[PDB]
Amino acid sequence: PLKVEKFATANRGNGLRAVTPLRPGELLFRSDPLAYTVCKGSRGVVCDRCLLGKEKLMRCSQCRVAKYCSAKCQKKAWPDHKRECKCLKSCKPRYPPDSVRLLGRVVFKLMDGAPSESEKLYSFYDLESNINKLTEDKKEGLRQLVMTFQHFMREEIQDASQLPPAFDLFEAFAKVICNSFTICNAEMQEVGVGLYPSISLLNHSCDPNCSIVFNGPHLLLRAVRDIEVGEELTICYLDMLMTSEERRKQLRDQYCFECDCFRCQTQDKDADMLTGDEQVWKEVQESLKKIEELKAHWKWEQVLAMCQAIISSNSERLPDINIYQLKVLDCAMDACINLGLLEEALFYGTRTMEPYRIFFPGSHPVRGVQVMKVGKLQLHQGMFPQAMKNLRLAFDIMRVTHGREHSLIEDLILLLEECDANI
Ligand SMILES: O=C1Cc2cc(C(=O)N[C@H]3C[C@H]4CC[C@@H](C3)N4S(=O)(=O)N3CCC(NCc4ccccc4)CC3)c(Cl)cc2N1
Ligand SMILES: C[S@@+](CC[C@H](N)C(=O)[O-])C[C@H]1O[C@@H](n2cnc3c(N)ncnc32)[C@H](O)[C@@H]1O
Ligand SMILES: [Zn+2]
Ligand SMILES: [Zn+2]
Ligand SMILES: [Zn+2]
């Protein structure tokens, strides 16, 4: 019994809107991907199927590229892995761009698979391609991806008959660039990339009324505000820790539109995001490219060493409300968590709390997770008043953003029961 419907918007293509009134935290839609895969940096670190980290993964012996937490996941992934296996084998030791592997899985799913539930409201066929808006160098990039695909698929796909009817590879890559979801794990690390075509109906806002959250590859779409019958549903395509200029560029480059929202009109919060010595935060911005690369490959010790040279720099420092400092602090926290340095993690974690309160207003899944992490760190150092405060806060946010259908909630519920014992 669906609470949402596709409709044609006035000036931003198709969209999704409420059929009934919606309360904050209400579950609107849930979906497995049409197709999905591990990100290049998380390959060999998380299970290809369920996208969880394990220190020891089993590999597919044919290709030795697909790896798995367990026999269960490896056997169940086989149907959707079969045909890419060969392609991946012959490609070695060089690995295709994530978008190519993803499209491969799309083409196999469409050709070999039953009709997907992910396409109930909107199919891959319907996805926006923005073809008449692409720049020539973006076009050039798509043509390279098309030829990369043909090379990668030379064995499994020789001609048009093995693609769907009237399938155009250029058009399909155009779809993939602006309809690919970055799948994040429970701790909000980017772990994979997928297509969820029904979810791709939702248009963008820098102040959205809905939210999406991932439980492995399974995506949950929830309302994070009150929403009236006939009102457009929106999610934020972007990281909240971006300036309007940074949002402008990515929404142009990747999604081919100009955002007309209040926040973009007023440069909302931009000034506060860029406080401190300009010179210092440009070096830190520079350095974050390297830091974020190390983090995507889970190289925690190096992430932390780089972060500590900024946070505890002998030279001039930034305020924690500065978004580049903030990012550096979050990376540091997470590095310390995974290296088992729980004291240092907590120092950093606590310092992110006020800026997150400001930058993730209402109910945002990323703040809820950050608060849980800080609450969790406190709990396991004996700070039971403070910990209980944050865990209840995390629950207040995540009951809206995650909901009882997400298993991280059950983990928090147990943490709440536990911390409740002391009092
Ligand atoms: O048709 C489509 C295709 C598509 C893609 C996306 C999408 O993938 N968005 C990204 C993933 C998530 C959700 C929004 C934003 C960008 N992120 S995030 O920022 O919430 N996310 C990824 C980055 C993480 N880390 C932030 C960080 C970076 C660097 C240092 C410290 C922290 C936190 C979780 C979204 Cl939201 C909608 C959508 N509709
Ligand atoms: C994932 S889709 C959203 C659904 C899309 N509108 C459609 O018709 O299929 C992304 C595309 O929708 C359009 N879009 C999304 N949010 C928008 C906004 N706030 N303003 C204008 N266009 C937007 C852009 O063309 C963008 O590339
Ligand atoms: Zn698994
Ligand atoms: Zn294989
Ligand atoms: Zn905007």
UniProtKB/Swiss-Prot annotation:
What are the protein's UniProt keywords? Acetylation, Chromatin regulator, Cytoplasm, Metal-binding, Methyltransferase, Nucleus, Phosphoprotein, S-adenosyl-L-methionine, Transferase, Zinc, Zinc-finger
One Gene Ontology MF term: RNA polymerase II complex binding
Q: Report residues binding S-adenosyl-L-methionine.
A: R12, G13, N14, Y122, N130, N179, N203, H204, Y237, F257
Where is this protein chiefly located? cytoplasm
Q: Name one GO cellular component term.
A: nucleus
Q: Which residues does the UniProt record annotate as the domain SET? A: 2-238
| Residue numbers binding Zn(2+) 1 | C47, C50, C69, C73
| Chain ranges of zinc fingers (MYND-type) | 47-85
Q: Which family does it belong to?
A: Belongs to the class V-like SAM-binding methyltransferase superfamily. Histone-lysine methyltransferase family.
What's this protein's name? Histone-lysine N-methyltransferase SMYD3
**Annotated organism of origin:** Homo sapiens
Supply the source organism's classification: Eukaryota, Metazoa, Chordata, Craniata, Vertebrata
